[PDB]
DNA sequence: TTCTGATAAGACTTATCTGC
DNA sequence: AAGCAGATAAGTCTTATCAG
């Protein structure tokens, strides 16, 4: 998280790690990634509510 | 396939098996399913091009 | 502490397989 | 044969984690 920063795309404000869009504008991990792979914004419709944990 | 039938949601016209929306209107397998689980239309943005095969 | 990449967990989509 | 509704999985894709 962080105070004063919102996802420039999914607009969420709680994302493990923040990244930057190809415009220097803050984006939540999901988004940041999704764009790097689809070179198109992140269809906000798959905007999930909470965040999942994971395992190694 | 089938002549004269288009996906009432994803508009595709090639879907393994056709289903019906809760309005009796033809829908391609993906859609038909996605709605039964999300009780909301199928975000067309995840409209895939071709169709994948699978294995058992 | 910040942020970009690479890796890979396993959540979701949706093709199949059945039973009407 | 045909058309459709439900269940059950199958990898595909999304995306939390791990490094640099
Ligand atoms: Zn976002
Ligand atoms: Zn459809």
DSSP string, A24-48: S-EEEHHHHHHHHHHSS---GGG--
Euclidean distance between CA atoms A49 and B11, whole angstroms: 28
Technique used by the depositors: X-ray
**A37 at interface of B, judged by CB pairs closer than 8 A:** no
Distance from CA of B31 to the nearest CA of A (A): 15
The resolution, in angstroms to one decimal, equals 3.1
The domain tally of chain B equals 1
**Contacts A–B by Cβ distance under 8 A:** 7
CATH number of the domain to which B45 belongs: 3.30.50.10
Contact B13, B5 (CB under 8 A): yes
Residue numbers of the domain that contains B14: 1-56
Euclidean distance between CA atoms B48 and A6, whole angstroms: 30
Contact B13, B4 (CB under 8 A): no
Cα A30 to averaged position of ligand 1 atoms, centre (Å): 6
């Amino acid at each position: 998280r962080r105070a004063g920063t919102s996802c420039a795309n999914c607009q969420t404000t709680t994302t493990t790690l923040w990244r930057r869009n190809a415009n220097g504008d803050p984006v939540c991990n999901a988004c940041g990634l999704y764009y790097k792979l689809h070179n198109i914004n992140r269809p906000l419709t798959m905007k999930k509510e909470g965040i999942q944990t994971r395992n190694r």
